[PDB]
Write a protein that binds this DNA or RNA. Structure first.
Lengths: 493, 471, 600, 140
RNA sequence: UGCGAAAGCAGUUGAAGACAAGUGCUUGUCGUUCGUUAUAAAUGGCCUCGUCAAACGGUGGAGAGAGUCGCUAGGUGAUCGUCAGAUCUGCCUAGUCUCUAUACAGCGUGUUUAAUUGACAUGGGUUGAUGCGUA
C-alpha cells in the first residue's frame, strides 16, 4: 500500500516578471520610519562592530542610532559649522568628522564629551575624513584645497604625506582592500586618481577618466573599483585599467554608493546606489551589475548605506534625503523530582549498537475541502470551495479536482436556487480571469442543463444569468480584440 | 482489501493497492502472511498480474513479484478484461464477455492492422529498461530480471481512489513518448490528458511535456519543468529527439508535430530551467502523423522527414539548407543515419540507403509484401533500430497460417551492415516481437509479446564436521 | 570554404637550379617558426640567391636579405625570435652545399649581425630547429646524426639513429614537449620509422618500426596533428603516430587520370583533416574525413602552382577559419617566369555542413529474403517506345502499360518497381518528342500522378498543359513539387473560380508563408489589386490566402479607396461567421386548488 | 513541487499641448513604475496619439513590453491599455519591422494575446448556451 | 467498426434456441448458438502508526487585508421638477494613490543546488453538552 497523494494545487503557465529570489529578500525590509533632520543628511556610515550603530551627519552635528532601538543614543554637537563625515574606525572605537572650517576632530565613539585629537587639516572645508581600513593609525582627509593629506593619529602636527594633482574639488576617497599602499581619490575633474603611498607620492600613478564629476568612489573588490559619477556608474579593473561594465539606468546624477558582501541574502554581493532622483537600486556584481530591486523616496537621495556583513541582528537599509528626511528600513531577525522522574527523553542512542527509526514525518494538516474529497463528500467539497475568504487558486483546484474525478453533475444534483447562487456569484467573477474561464465554461454549462426548469420559476437566478450574459459578452469583445492585435502584430513581421 | 471481522461485523482496510484484487488467501499455519493477486486494469492491451505477499503483522509488502509490464498498442492473444457491474473500457459486464471474446478472435483473424508494437526506453548511465505504462513508468532491471521501481509520472486519478462503476469509464493521462538525453541525467516525457465525457471541454485533449532530473544514487525522478500545450493548443507532439553530445553537451531536445513544426528546447543554467531556444513555423495546412527526425552527430544539420518529403535543415539558422528536398514514393515512417555518411530512410513501401556525400541511393529493399497496413504510422521507427558502430537491424513479423490466418505468429530479425550491402546475420524467433532497440553495448535487446526480453549480439574430523553441521 | 586569388610576394631569380620547374620546390625552403597563423613575416631561403624575410601585410615588402653565392643550395632554413644572453634577438639557422664536397652549417643572430658562426657539418642538414628558451640549434643530418648546437655552433650532444639516407624529418609539439620523427628508406620498399623525444641524454627514442609497402620516389609526404599523409598514385595513405599505423586509404579519382611525368603535384596540410592539393594550375581544398572537395579554383594566368608551406589552423581550438598558403607560380610563355605567390584560405567549420554534396567519388528493388504465411527491363521499354512513329498514341500507351503491366492510369502502390528515376525521365522525353500539340498519351496522366516525377521536368509543366484543362487539373492535384512561382502566377492570371480555389489549396498545403510571402511581394500591384477585387465581388484557404496578400502588399502600397471596400466586405463576413457559429452550438445542444373533469 | 510551469508560446529566450512624452521618456528609461503609472492614467485618445507620435522609436519598443505586462497581470486594464498598444504598432510600424528580433523582445505580447485568443471558441459556446436559456424563460 | 488529424469522411447495430413473468398469445432476460469490419439503482465510498508552536530555503500569486468623498474613466437609482435642472452633500464598477508580518497558496529543510528548532507523561477518572463565544 501507498500513502494518499496530496491534492496538487493548480499552477497556470508563468506570467512576466515573477517574483525573483532577489526581490523576495529585499522586500523583507518592511518596517519604515521617517525621521526629520535639520538640513540635508550628507553622509551615513555604519560601525563595523557590534551592535553596528550607524552615524548620520546632518547640519552641524552627528547622531548615532541604536540598531535594535532605531533611535538616537549619542549626539555630537560641538561642531560649529556644517559637518561632512562620520566614518568609524575598523575597530569601531573612534569616530572622525570634517568641518567647513577645515578642522578634523576624532572622538571616542559613544563618548561625545571626550575629544581625542583635533587637527586643522586646512583653511578650506574638509568634506571627507575616512580611516584607513588596513592600518588604524593613519587618517586621510580630502579638502576643498584639492590636496588629500594622509595624516597619522600619533603625529597630528604635519601630514605624513600630502597627495596632490587634483585640479578641482576632491570629495571622494577610497582605500583598496589588500593593497594598503594604494589610495584612490576622485575629483569633479572627471578623473579617478590612484596614488602609491609607499613611493614618494604626490603624483598619481595613473588616472581613470569618467568624463563627469565623480560623486563617490567605492572599491568593490581587491581588483575592481566601482566609481559613480554623472548620470551613470562604471566599474574599472586596475590590472587592465579599463571599464568592464557601465549602467545608466538612473535619471538624476548618482551621489552615493555602498557595497555589502557575503551576507545571508540569495545574492552573495549587493551594490546600493543612490540616484538623486529618489531612487536607490540594488545591483548584483555577479551578474554584470544588473538591476534586481529598487525603492522610491520623497525627494533626491544623497546618502545610502546598509548594515555590514556581520550585523548579528536585524539588518538595516538607511537612505538620506536632501530635504533632511532620514528613511530607515529594517529586516527583523517542572520539579527536580519530576525531572529525575522522566529523564530518558533527551537521549538519542549515541552509545547504542543499533538505532531503529520508524516514526513517520508529520504531514501538514489538510484543509476542509481536501478532507471532503478524500472521504468522497462531493456535494460538500463544492460548498467548501465557495466560502468567504477562500484563496482563488485554492478555489480553482477543487473545481478542477471534481471535474477530473468525473463528479460534476453528481456535485450539482441536490441543490436549489438558495445553494446555487454562491456558485453563480463566483462564476460571475471567475469568468473574467483567463485561467478560470474554461472551468467556468464547463460548470455553468452543466447547471443550465440541469436546472433549466428551476430557472424559470426562480427570479433571482434569472438576474444572475442576465448579468452573467453581460460579462461573457464583455469577454467576447476582449478576446476578439486580442485576436485583432495578433493580426496586426503579424503584419509587422 | 477488506478484513471483515465476523464476530461484530466490523472491518479493517488496506487501500491504494497497485491494482484490483483478483484473489486473496491466508497463507500460514497461523495466518502470518496474506497472498494477493493484483491486475492493474489500466493496461487493457495485456493482463498484468502482480503477486503480493503481505506480512499480516503490519500489512507491509513482504514480497512483491511481477514481470515486465509493457503496454501494447492493441489487445493480444485471448486477453479478456475482468468482469464488472457494467460494460466499460476497462471492464466487461455479464453479457458483454462472450461477444467480446468472439469479436476479439474475429479482429485478430480477419482484420489486417495487427500492430502490437510497444514503446520502451533504455537508460544509458544505468542500462535499466523503462516501460511507459499508462500514466506511469515502470523501471525494470533485465540483468537481474527484477523490477526496480514504479513511478507515477502524471497527474490524474491514478492511485487517489479506486474507480468503480461509471468512474471506471474515466481515462487517465497517457504517457505517449518517453526518452532520455545522451548523458542520461535528463528524462523527457510527453503526456496526453483526456477530458471527462459529457462536458463542453470534452473534445480538447491536453498535450503536456515534462523534464525530470535525478542524481545517479537516487532512484526517483524529480520533475524539474512542465510545459502545458507545447507547439500551441491541441497539437500533438508526434516525435521527440534528444540532442547529440556536440550540441549543448546533450542538454537539449527537438520536438516535432504533425504540422511539421520543430521546436528546439535546451537547459539554460542561468534560468536553471529548460527554455524554448528555437522555433520553426508549423503553419502549412498538411496533416500527417508520419514524421521522423534524425540529427547528425556533429549536430550541424537535422533531417526532418514529413509525409513523403524529407528536409535537410541547418541547425544554426533552423531553416532549409542552402538537394535539401528529397521526395519519396510514400510517407516516411523512419529516418536514421547508421553513420555520419549514410542515411537510411524507411517508407511505407520500401527502405532506401542514401549517400549524403553523393546524394544517390545505394540500395533499395522492398517492404510492401510484409508491411502494407499492419502497422500504424511511426511504429516502424520502434521496430527498426541502429547501432552507432557496427550496423542496423530490420524486424519483420509474419502471420503464420495453414489451410485462413491463425493467431500465432513468426518473427524474423535481420542484421544489416551500413548502407545495406550485406546481411551480417539472419535470425528467426517463434513469437511476435513488439520492440527491438540497440543497447549501448554492441548487443541489441528485443521484447516479445510473451514479455520475454531476448538479446541478439556478438578422516574422523570430516565425519565429525558433517555431524556437527547436522546437529 | 573559399579560395582567394593569389597575390604576389616576390619574383624568383633566373637561376639554372630554379629553371627546373619540377624540382623548383626543393630549392625554396620556408622557415617553420616565422610562418604560422599569427605571424605577418615569412623567412624564405632561395637556393643561390639569399635567405630573405618578407612582411605580408598591409603590403608585401622585403624586410631583410642575406646574400648567398649562386653555387650554393639551401638545404634547410629556420628562423625564430627569442631572448639570448637578455636582448630580444632573432636567430637564423641555414645549411648549404657547395657541390656536395663540403657541408656548411650557419647560425646568425640579429638584434630586434650580433654574431655569425660557421662550421662544417658531416652530412646533409635535412631540417633545422631553433630552441630559443634553451638557446640551442638542433640539426638533423642525412647520415642519421642528430647534433645539438648552441647559438655559437659549439657541439653539445650528438645522437645517431643508426640508419643512413634520411629523407624526411619533422617536429611537432604535444603537451609542451618537443618530438621529432624520421623516415629512412630501406630496400624493397621498406622504411624505418622512428620517434624521438627531446627533454641524461636530451634525445630519447620512443618508437622504432619498419614499414613495408611504403615507396618514396613517387610519394609526397606531409604531417598534421598526429597523422602522416602520403600521396601516391592518386591514393592518400593515412598513418597514425606514434606507431605510424596505416589507418585509412583515400582514393582521389581526379589524380588517377594524370599521365605520369607531365603533371606537377603539390600537397600540404591546412587544418585538421583538411589538405591543399595542386594539380598544375588547379588548387583543391579537400576534406579527408568526409571525402569531399570543399573548394576548387583554377589559376588561368599561370602554367602551374606549387605549394611550399601552409599556416595550419587548430580549428578545434581556434575560432579563426582563415589562413594562408605560400607557393611558386609559373607563368605561360616562351620565357616562363617564376614568382612567390601567397593565397588566402578559408578552411571552414570542419562540420558535415560544408562537405554535403561535394564528394569527389563517383537502382533496382531487391527482395528482403531470397527464399505458409499470410501476405497482407528499363532499356528495352525505352527502345520500344523510342522506335515508335510520331503522334501514335494508341501503340505508345499500349507498349507502356502492357510491358510494365500497369492496370490503372494513375500511380498506385503496386507500381513501385517502376519508380526508378532513370526510366521515368526518359519516358517523359519521349512523350514530348513523340507528341506535340493538343493530343498527349495517357502515360503522361500516369506519370503526373507518380510521386517521383522528376524535378527537372516540373519547370514550365503547367504552361505545357495549359491547353488541355484535364491535364492541367491533374497536374495541380497530384503533380509533385510543382514550382510556387508558376502556381502563384497562374493564381492571379486565371479567371476560373474552380481553378482558383484548387490552386489556393495546393499552394498552402505545400508551402510556408515565409516561402510564399516573399514571392507574393514580387507580383505586380495590379494583379493583386484584381485578385482582391475578385474577393469583394474551402473558401477559408481562399481567405487565408488573402491575408498573405495583405501582408505582402505592405502598409504603404495599399490605397485608401479599395481599403474601404475590403472593410465593408470583411465586416459582413465577420458577422456571418459569428451568426453561423452560434447555430453550430445550437445543433450540438402543485397548485393548492385544481379544476379537472373526472372520466367515467 | 517547485517546478516551473510554462507554455509553448513563451518565445522569451529565442501636435497638441498636454503631451506627456517628456515624463514618459524619463519613466521608461528609469523603470519608474509610479511615474509611468501617472502617464498611463491619462485617457484622452487625442493625447495618446500625440505622445507615441513624438516618442523616440527606441523607447517605443520597451513601452510595448511594459504595457504588455500590465495587461497580463491586471486583466481589467486590458481595455484602456489596448489603445496604447494599437497606437504604438501603427506609429512605429516602420521601425518595428526593421528590428533583428521581435519574438524575444515582444514575447510578453504574444503570450498575453495568445492566451486571450485561445479562449474565443469556448466563450462563444457558453454564449450560445446562455442565450438559449435566457431567451426561453423570457418568452415564457 | 474501417480510414484519417486532433477535425472528420464512410458504415453497422441481424437471425436462431432456451428460461422467467403476465395473459396458445404479449413482454423481458441469457456464465446458449450462428453471422457482419462492427442508463444505473441490495442505503452500498479507501486503515493505523504524533499532534501543536515557531522559524528557514526555493516555486507561484488573481496578491491577504485596511484606508483615501485624493484623482481618472465609466454604469446607475429615490423624490421633486416649470425638463432646464434640484436636493439624497446618492450608490456601484474599474483603475490610480497610502499602509502593513508578502501579510496569500504551495513544495521541502530524513539530504539536498538551498534550507530547523522547540513543547508535550501522545495515559486513566469526574463535571459540563441546555458546551463555549456571539447577535
Amino acid at each position: 500500500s501507498t500513502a494518499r497523494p496530496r491534492i496538487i494545487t493548480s499552477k497556470a503557465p508563468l506570467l512576466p516578471q515573477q517574483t525573483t529570489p532577489e526581490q523576495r529578500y529585499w522586500r523583507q525590509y518592511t518596517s519604515a520610519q521617517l525621521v526629520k533632520e535639520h538640513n540635508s543628511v550628507t553622509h551615513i556610515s555604519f560601525n563595523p562592530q557590534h551592535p553596528h550603530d550607524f552615524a548620520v551627519t546632518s547640519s552641524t552635528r552627528v547622531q548615532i542610532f541604536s540598531s535594535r532601538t532605531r533611535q538616537v543614543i549619542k549626539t555630537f554637537s560641538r561642531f560649529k559649522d556644517v559637518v561632512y563625515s562620520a566614518s568609524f574606525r575598523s575597530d569601531g572605537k573612534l569616530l572622525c568628522a570634517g568641518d567647513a572650517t577645515g578642522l578634523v576632530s576624532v572622538y571616542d565613539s559613544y563618548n561625545p564629551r571626550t575629544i581625542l585629537l583635533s587637527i586643522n587639516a586646512s583653511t578650506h572645508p574638509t568634506h571627507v575624513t575616512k580611516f584607513h581600513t588596513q592600518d588604524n593609525k593613519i587618517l586621510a582627509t580630502a579638502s576643498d584645497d584639492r590636496v588629500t593629506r594622509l595624516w597619522d593619529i600619533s603625529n597630528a602636527y604635519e601630514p605624513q604625506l600630502e597627495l596632490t594633482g587634483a585640479t578641482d574639488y576632491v570629495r571622494t576617497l577610497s582605500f583598496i582592500p589588500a593593497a594598503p599602499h594604494l589610495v584612490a581619490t576622485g575629483s569633479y575633474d572627471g578623473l579617478i586618481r590612484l596614488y602609491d603611498t609607499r613611493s614618494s607620492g604626490s603624483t598619481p600613478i595613473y588616472s581613470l577618466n569618467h568624463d563627469q564629476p565623480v560623486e563617490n568612489v567605492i572599491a568593490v573588490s581587491p581588483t575592481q573599483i566601482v566609481s559613480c559619477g554623472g548620470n551613470n556608474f562604471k566599474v574599472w579593473d586596475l590590472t587592465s585599467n579599463k571599464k568592464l561594465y557601465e549602467r545608466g539606468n538612473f535619471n538624476k546624477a548618482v551621489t552615493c554608493l555602498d557595497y555589502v558582501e557575503n551576507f545571508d541574502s540569495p545574492m552573495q554581493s549587493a551594490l546600493i546606489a543612490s540616484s538623486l532622483d529618489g531612487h536607490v537600486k540594488v545591483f548584483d556584481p555577479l551578474d554584470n551589475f544588473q538591476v534586481k530591486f529598487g525603492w522610491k523616496f520623497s525627494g533626491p537621495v544623497l546618502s545610502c548605506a546598509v548594515s555590514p556583513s556581520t550585523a548579528q541582528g536585524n539588518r538595516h537599509l538607511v537612505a538620506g534625503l536632501s530635504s533632511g528626511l532620514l528613511a530607515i528600513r529594517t529586516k527583523k531577525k517542572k520539579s527536580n523530582n519530576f525531572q529525575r522522574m522522566m529523564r530518558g527523553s533527551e537521549y538519542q542512542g549515541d552509545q547504542e549498537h543499533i538505532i531503529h527509526n520508524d516514526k513517520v514525518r508529520s504531514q501538514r494538516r489538510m484543509r476542509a475541502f481536501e478532507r471532503n474529497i478524500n472521504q468522497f463528500k462531493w456535494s460538500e467539497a463544492l460548498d467548501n470551495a465557495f466560502v468567504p475568504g477562500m484563496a482563488k487558486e485554492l478555489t480553482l483546484t477543487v473545481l478542477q479536482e471534481l471535474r477530473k474525478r468525473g463528479k460534476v453533475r453528481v456535485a450539482l444534483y441536490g441543490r436549489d436556487e438558495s445553494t446555487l447562487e454562491p456558485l453563480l456569484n463566483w462564476c460571475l467573477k471567475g469568468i473574467e480571469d483567463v485561467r478560470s474561464a474554461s472551468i467556468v465554461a464547463d460548470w455553468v454549462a452543466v447547471v443550465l442543463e440541469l436546472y433549466g426548469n428551476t430557472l424559470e420559476s426562480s427570479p433571482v437566478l434569472q438576474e444572475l444569468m442576465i448579468d452573467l450574459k453581460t460579462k461573457v459578452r464583455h469577454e467576447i469583445h476582449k478576446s476578439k480584440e486580442a485576436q485583432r492585435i495578433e493580426g496586426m502584430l503579424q503584419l509587422l513581421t | 482489501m477488506s478484513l471483515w471481522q465476523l464476530e461484530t461485523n466490523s472491518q479493517q482496510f488496506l487501500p491504494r493497492l497497485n491494482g484490483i484484487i483478483i484473489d486473496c488467501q491466508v497463507l500460514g499455519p497461523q495466518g502470518n502472511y496474506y497472498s494477493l493477486i493484483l491486475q492493474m486494469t489500466e493496461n487493457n492491451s495485456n493482463s498484468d498480474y502482480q503477486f503480493l505477499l503481505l506480512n499480516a503483522s503490519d500489512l507491509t509488502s513482504k514480497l512483491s513479484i511481477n514481470g515486465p509490464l509493457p503496454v501494447f498498442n492493441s489487445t493480444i492473444k485471448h486477453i479478456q478484461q475482468p468482469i464488472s457491474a457494467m460494460n466499460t473500457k476497462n471492464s466487461n459486464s455479464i453479457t458483454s464477455l462472450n461477444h467480446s471474446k468472439k469479436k476479439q478472435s474475429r479482429k485478430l483473424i480477419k482484420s489486417r492492422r495487427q500492430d502490437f508494437t510497444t514503446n520502451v526506453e533504455i537508460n544509458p548511465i544505468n542500462k535499466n529498461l523503462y516501460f511507459p505504462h499508462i500514466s506511469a513508468v515502470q523501471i525494470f532491471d533485465f540483468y537481474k530480471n527484477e523490477q526496480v521501481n514504479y513511478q507515477y509520472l502524471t497527474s490524474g486519478v491514478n492511485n487517489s481512489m479506486g474507480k468503480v462503476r461509471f468512474e471506471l469509464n474515466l481515462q487517465d493521462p497517457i504517457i505517449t513518448d518517453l526518452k532520455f538525453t545522451k548523458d542520461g541525467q535528463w528524462m523527457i516525457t510527453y503526456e496526453i490528458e483526456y477530458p471527462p465525457n459529457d462536458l463542453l471541454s470534452s473534445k480538447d485533449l491536453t498535450h503536456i511535456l515534462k523534464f525530470w532530473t535525478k542524481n545517479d544514487n537516487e532512484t526517483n525522478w524529480n520533475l524539474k519543468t512542465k510545459v502545458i500545450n507545447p507547439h500551441g493548443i491541441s497539437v500533438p507532439i508526434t516525435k521527440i529527439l534528444p540532442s547529440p553530445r556536440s550540441v549543448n553537451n546533450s542538454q537539449g531536445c527537438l520536438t516535432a508535430d504533425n504540422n511539421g513544426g520543430l521546436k528546439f528546447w535546451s537547459f539554460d543554467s542561468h534560468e536553471s530551467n529548460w527554455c524554448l531556444k528555437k522555433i520553426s513555423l508549423p503553419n502549412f495546412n498538411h496533416f500527417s502523423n508520419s514524421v521522423s527526425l534524425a540529427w547528425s552527430q556533429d549536430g550541424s544539420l537535422i533531417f526532418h522527414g514529413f509525409d513523403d518529403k524529407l528536409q535537410i535543415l541547418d541547425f544554426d539558422t533552423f531553416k532549409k539548407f542552402e538537394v535539401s528536398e528529397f521526395t519519396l514514393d510514400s510517407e516516411i515512417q523512419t529516418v536514421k543515419l547508421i553513420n555520419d555518411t549514410n542515411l537510411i530512410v524507411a517508407t511505407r513501401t520500401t527502405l532506401n540507403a542514401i549517400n549524403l556525400l553523393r546524394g544517390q541511393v545505394i540500395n533499395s529493399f522492398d517492404l510492401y509484401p510484409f508491411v502494407n497496413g499492419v502497422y500504424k504510422n511511426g511504429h516502424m521507427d520502434r521496430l527498426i533500430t541502429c547501432d552507432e558502430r557496427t550496423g542496423n537491424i530490420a524486424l519483420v513479423i509474419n502471420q503464420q497460417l495453414t489451410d485462413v490466418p491463425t493467431i500465432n505468429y513468426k518473427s524474423r530479425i535481420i542484421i544489416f551492415d551500413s548502407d545495406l550491402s550485406t546481411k551480417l546475420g539472419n535470425f528467426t524467433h517463434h513469437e511476435y516481437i513488439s520492440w527491438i532497440g540497440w543497447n549501448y553495448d554492441t548487443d541489441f535487446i528485443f521484447l516479445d509479446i510473451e514479455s520475454t526480453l531476448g538479446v541478439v549480439g556478438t578422516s574422523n574430523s570430516d565425519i565429525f564436521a558433517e555431524q556437527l553441521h547436522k546437529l | 570554404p573559399s579560395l582567394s586569388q593569389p597575390f604576389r610576394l616576390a619574383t624568383l631569380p633566373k637561376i639554372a637550379s630554379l629553371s627546373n620547374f619540377s624540382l623548383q620546390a626543393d630549392y625554396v625552403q620556408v622557415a617553420d617558426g616565422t610562418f604560422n597563423e599569427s605571424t605577418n613575416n615569412i623567412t624564405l631561403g632561395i637556393s643561390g640567391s639569399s635567405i630573405s624575410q618578407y612582411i605580408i601585410n598591409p603590403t608585401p615588402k622585403l624586410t631583410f636579405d642575406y646574400p648567398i653565392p649562386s653555387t650554393n643550395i639551401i638545404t634547410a632554413c629556420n628562423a625564430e625570435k627569442g631572448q639570448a644572453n637578455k636582448r630580444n634577438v632573432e636567430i637564423w639557422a641555414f645549411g648549404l652545399m657547395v657541390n656536395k664536397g663540403n657541408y656548411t652549417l650557419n647560425v646568425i643572430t640579429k638584434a630586434l649581425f650580433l654574431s655569425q658562426y660557421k662550421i662544417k657539418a658531416k652530412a646533409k642538414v635535412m631540417s633545422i630547429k631553433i630552441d630559443t628558451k634553451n638557446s640551442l640549434v638542433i640539426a638533423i643530418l642525412q647520415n642519421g646524426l642528430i647534433e645539438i648546437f648552441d647559438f655559437k655552433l659549439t657541439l653539445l650532444h650528438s645522437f645517431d639513429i643508426s640508419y643512413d639516407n634520411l629523407k624526411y624529418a619533422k617536429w611537432f609539439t604535444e603537451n609542451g614537449t618537443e618530438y621529432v620523427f624520421v623516415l629512412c628508406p630501406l630496400q624493397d620498399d621498406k622504411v624505418c620509422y622512428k620517434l624521438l623525444e627531446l627533454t641524461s641524454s636530451p634525445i630519447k627514442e620512443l618508437s622504432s618500426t619498419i614499414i613495408e609497402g611504403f615507396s618514396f620516389e613517387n610519394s609526397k609526404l606531409c604531417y598534421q596533428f598526429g597523422k602522416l599523409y602520403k600521396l601516391n598514385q592518386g591514393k592518400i595513405y593515412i598513418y597514425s603516430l606514434p606507431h605510424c599505423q596505416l589507418q585509412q586509404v583515400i582514393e582521389f579519382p581526379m589524380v588517377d587520370k594524370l599521365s605520369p611525368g607531365d603533371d606537377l603535384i603539390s600537397f600540404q596540410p591546412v587544418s585538421v583533416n583538411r589538405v591543399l592539393l595542386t594539380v598544375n594550375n588547379v588548387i583543391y581544398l579537400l576534406d579527408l574525413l568526409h571525402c569531399s572537395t570543399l573548394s576548387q579554383r583554377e589559376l588561368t594566368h599561370v602554367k602551374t602552382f606549387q605549394l611550399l608551406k601552409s599556416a595550419v589552423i587548430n580549428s578545434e581550438k581556434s575560432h579563426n577559419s582563415k589562413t594562408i598558403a605560400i607557393g611558386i607560380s609559373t607563368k605561360n610563355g616562351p620565357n616562363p617566369t617564376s614568382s612567390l605567390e601567397i593565397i588566402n584560405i578559408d578552411v571552414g567549420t570542419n562540420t558535415l555542413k560544408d562537405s554535403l554534396g561535394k564528394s569527389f567519388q563517383v537502382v533496382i528493388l531487391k527482395p528482403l529474403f531470397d527464399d505458409r504465411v499470410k501476405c497482407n527491363h528499363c532499356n528495352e521499354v525505352i527502345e520500344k517506345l523510342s522506335a515508335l512513329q510520331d503522334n501514335d498514341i494508341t501503340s505508345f500507351d499500349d507498349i507502356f502499360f502492357k510491358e510494365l503491366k500497369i492496370k490503372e492510369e494513375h500511380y498506385t502502390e503496386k507500381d513501385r518497381y517502376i519508380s526508378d528515376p532513370g526510366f521515368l525521365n526518359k519516358v517523359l522525353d519521349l512523350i514530348f518528342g513523340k507528341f506535340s500539340g493538343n493530343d498527349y498519351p495517357k502515360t503522361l496522366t500516369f506519370l503526373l500522378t507518380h510521386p517521383l516525377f522528376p524535378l527537372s521536368r516540373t519547370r514550365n509543366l503547367l504552361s505545357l498543359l495549359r491547353d488541355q484543362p484535364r491535364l492541367f487539373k491533374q497536374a495541380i492535384v497530384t503533380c509533385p513539387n510543382l514550382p510556387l512561382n508558376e502556381l502563384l502566377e497562374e493564381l492571379f492570371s486565371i479567371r476560373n473560380r474552380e481553378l482558383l480555389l484548387d490552386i489556393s489549396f495546393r499552394i498552402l498545403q505545400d508551402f510556408t508563408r515565409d516561402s510564399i510571402k516573399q514571392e507574393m511581394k514580387k507580383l505586380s500591384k495590379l494583379d493583386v489589386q484584381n485578385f482582391i477585387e475578385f474577393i469583394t465581388s474551402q473558401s477559408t484557404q481562399l481567405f487565408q490566402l488573402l491575408s498573405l496578400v495583405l501582408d505582402s502588399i505592405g502598409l504603404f502600397s495599399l490605397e485608401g479607396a479599395l481599403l474601404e471596400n475590403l472593410t465593408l466586405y470583411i465586416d459582413k463576413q465577420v458577422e456571418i461567421a459569428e451568426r453561423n457559429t452560434e447555430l453550430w452550438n445550437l445543433i450540438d445542444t402543485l397548485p393548492t386548488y385544481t379544476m379537472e373533469y373526472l372520466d367515467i | 513541487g517547485n517546478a516551473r510551469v510554462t507554455s509553448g508560446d513563451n518565445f522569451k529566450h529565442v501636435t497638441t499641448t498636454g503631451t506627456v512624452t517628456v515624463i514618459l521618456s524619463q519613466a521608461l528609461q528609469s523603470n519608474d513604475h509610479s511615474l509611468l503609472e501617472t502617464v498611463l492614467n491619462n485617457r484622452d485618445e487625442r493625447v495618446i496619439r500625440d505622445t507615441i507620435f513624438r516618442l523616440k522609436p527606441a523607447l517605443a519598443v520597451i513601452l510595448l513590453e511594459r504595457l504588455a505586462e500590465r495587461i497580463a497581470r491586471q486583466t481589467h486594464r486590458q481595455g484602456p491599455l489596448n489603445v496604447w498598444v494599437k497606437w504604438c504598432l501603427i506609429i512605429h510600424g516602420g521601425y518595428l519591422v526593421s528590428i533583428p528580433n521581435l519574438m524575444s523582445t515582444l514575447s510578453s505580447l504574444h503570450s498575453t494575446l495568445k492566451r486571450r485568443s485561445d479562449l474565443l471558441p469556448r466563450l462563444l459556446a457558453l454564449d450560445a448556451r446562455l442565450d438559449c436559456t435566457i431567451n426561453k424563460f423570457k418568452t415564457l
